[PDB]
């Protein structure tokens, strides 16, 4: 499925993910597409910062959800 990551530079990143993917996995995918090191990524969804090791499903992140990237 695809989710969208909005940055504060006005970019929207499209990612192909399964709901069993980890936040770690999602941050790796953002490394692959934008060269951002995972340790510098905060991922925000619906008013909370997402924890590495938990899955998209665990946070209820559905198809076409919008996350917000903030650099640490």
């Amino acid at each position: 499925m695809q989710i969208f990551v909005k940055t504060l530079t006005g970019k929207t990143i499209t990612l192909e993910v399964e709901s069993s993917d980890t936040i770690d996995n999602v941050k790796s995918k953002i490394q692959d597409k934008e060269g951002i090191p995972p340790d510098q990524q905060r991922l925000i969804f619906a008013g909370k910062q997402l924890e590495d090791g938990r899955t998209l499903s665990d946070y209820n992140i559905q198809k076409e959800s919008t996350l917000h990237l903030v650099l640490r």
Partner: protein, 225 residues
């Protein structure tokens, strides 16, 4: 309740504490799939706070939408000035219980742009007390509203200054009796045409709604479109 009575109730609310405006891209979808099941899981609907003298924009990207004017008495799940994101009701939870409990108590991304305070990310905005928000230095402008009567207070500074605000966002569960009018963009033939289709569909079910033009903190009855 008849057409003139709905209009009168609408304009009274508009000129007091305000009410709701819900534009829709697909009015046949809204009629058949949102409105009709309420007569015989789209429990929460997005809408925008409108009020006389509040220069509030509506969500209408290409300026060609119709929609519903909805009573200030609809059940309120939460209100967020800058539309802090919410999650969809997950499987296994009751939709009617989901808000205000899971409604963000402040706009995380909004408060962070405003203050650059990285402590903000240490909390869950849905599970935070007023005291915690004070400790984080979360400005009042980014705190959500849960009592409808207090939305005009949240919107008072732009209203007093006469400034334009982007579309605000309430989560409401509206009942058929809450539907007071049909929104019409006077400069859009497509909006007017959709509005007529919607008026006919609603009238056939016993809900004869006025046509309402809203713009820039003013609202007027349109005799026909």
């Amino acid at each position: 309740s008849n057409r003139q009575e709905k209009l009168a109730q609408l304009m009274r609310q508009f000129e007091s504490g305000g009410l709701y405006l819900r534009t829709v891209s697909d009015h046949r979808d809204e009629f058949e799939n949102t409105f009709m099941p309420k007569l015989d899981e789209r429990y929460w609907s997005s809408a925008t706070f409108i009020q006389q003298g509040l220069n509030g924009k509506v969500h209408d990207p290409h300026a060609d939408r119709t929609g519903l004017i909805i009573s200030a008495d609809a059940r309120l799940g939460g209100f967020s000035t800058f539309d802090a994101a919410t999650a969809n009701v997950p499987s296994g939870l009751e939709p009617s219980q989901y808000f205000p409990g899971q409604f963000p108590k402040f706009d995380m991304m909004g408060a962070y742009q405003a203050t650059w305070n990285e402590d903000i990310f240490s909390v869950d905005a849905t599970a935070v007390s007023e005291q915690q928000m004070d400790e984080l230095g979360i400005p009042d402008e980014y705190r959500s509203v849960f009592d409808f009567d207090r939305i005009q207070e949240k919107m008072a500074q732009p209203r007093l200054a006469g400034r334009e605000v982007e579309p605000t966002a309430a989560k409401i569960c509206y009942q058929p009796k809450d539907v007071l009018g049909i929104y019409v963009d006077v400069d859009s033939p497509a909006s007017q045409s959709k509005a007529r289709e919607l008026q006919q569909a609603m009238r056939e079910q016993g809900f004869d709604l006025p046509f309402i033009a809203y713009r820039g903190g003013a609202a007027q009855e349109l005799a026909s479109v």
